[PDB]
Paper text:
Rho GTPases control cell shape, polarity and motility by regulation of the actin cytoskeleton. Afp18 mediates toxicity via a glycosyltransferase domain that disrupts RhoA GTPase-dependent actin organization. We find that non-reversible glycosylation at a highly conserved tyrosine residue is responsible for the loss of RhoA activity. Taken together, we found that Afp18 is a mono-O-glycosyltransferase, which selectively uses UDP-GlcNAc as sugar donor substrate to modify Rho GTPases site-specifically at a switch I tyrosine residue.
To identify the site of modification and gain insights into the structural alteration caused by GlcNAcylation of RhoA, we crystallized Afp18-modified RhoA in the presence of magnesium and GDP and solved the X-ray structure at 2.0 Å resolution. In the RhoA structure, we could clearly assign additional electron density at the hydroxyl group of tyrosine-34 to an attached N-acetylglucosamine moiety. Interestingly, despite the presence of magnesium in the crystallization conditions, the structure revealed an unusual GDP-bound but magnesium-free conformation. The overall fold of the crystal structure of GlcNAcylated RhoA is very similar to known structures of Rho GTPases. However, the switch regions, especially the switch I region, adopt a conformation with tyrosine-34 positioned away from the nucleotide binding pocket, resulting in a structure distinct from the structures of RhoA bound to GDP41 or GTP42, which is generally not compatible with effector and regulator interaction. Tyrosine-34 is located within the effector loop region conserved in all Rho family GTPases. The defined electron density of the sugar attached to the hydroxyl group of tyrosine-34 revealed the α-anomeric configuration of the glycosidic bond. This finding implies that the glycosylation mechanism proceeds under retention of the stereochemistry of D-α-GlcNAc. We assume that steric constraints of the attached GlcNAc-residue results in the distorted conformation, which is incompatible with regulator and effector interaction. This assumption was underlined by the finding that the RhoGEF LARG, p50RhoGAP and the effectors ROCK and Rhotekin were unable to interact with Afp18-modified RhoA.
Author numbering: 3 to 180
The structure:
Amino acid sequence: AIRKKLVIVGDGACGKTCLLIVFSKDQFPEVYVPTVFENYVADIEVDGKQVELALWDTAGQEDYDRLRPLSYPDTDVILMCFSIDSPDSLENIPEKWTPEVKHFCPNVPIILVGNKKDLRNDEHTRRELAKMKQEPVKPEEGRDMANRIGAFGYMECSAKTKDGVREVFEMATRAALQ
Ligand SMILES: Nc1nc2c(ncn2[C@@H]2O[C@H](COP(=O)(O)OP(=O)(O)O)[C@@H](O)[C@H]2O)c(=O)[nH]1
Ligand SMILES: *[C@H]1O[C@H](CO)[C@@H](O)[C@H](O)[C@H]1NC(C)=O
């Protein structure tokens, strides 16, 4: 049975747990899904192959710099997340998450994921970000960061609408396999 360990990282509130939840809920047959993910085993089928994806969430540990990395050994793929409603979350990709992940997970493939894409054209978030002299992340900034950090790929998604979620995990699975 092919098993791959997936760790999701990124700033607090950038949507890591909701992303795992939407994906996990999409499994068939339908199962009851918990609200915490550590070696959570999800079954996926990708290009005719059954894969056990063991999901680890760093939500709740984003400030535990010494404890969080204990989860990194044997990781096969990384979902590195920022939120499209938070340019600050994007800046932490090269400043915090990428040096960390490359240190503890050398040569482990990274999927760069822009969560909450439904917020890009959200009138309320535009207003809030404007108070800080910021605006939503544009797709091209996401793509350029992916190249900059050497990510396997860049994907945008919304856990709210579910758009792009499937494809995030398909890409992560292919990367873990390859
Ligand atoms: N609009 C929108 N909100 C989201 C999305 N994903 C998560 N959220 C909300 O953003 C907040 C943080 O999500 P969570 O998954 O707990 O982030 P975490 O801190 O990285 O685990 C919660 O209020 C979520 O309901 C999304 O795709 N779109
Ligand atoms: C399972 O999910 C429900 C929401 O769907 C939540 O109320 C419950 O606390 C969760 N149980 C566990 C063990 O995560």
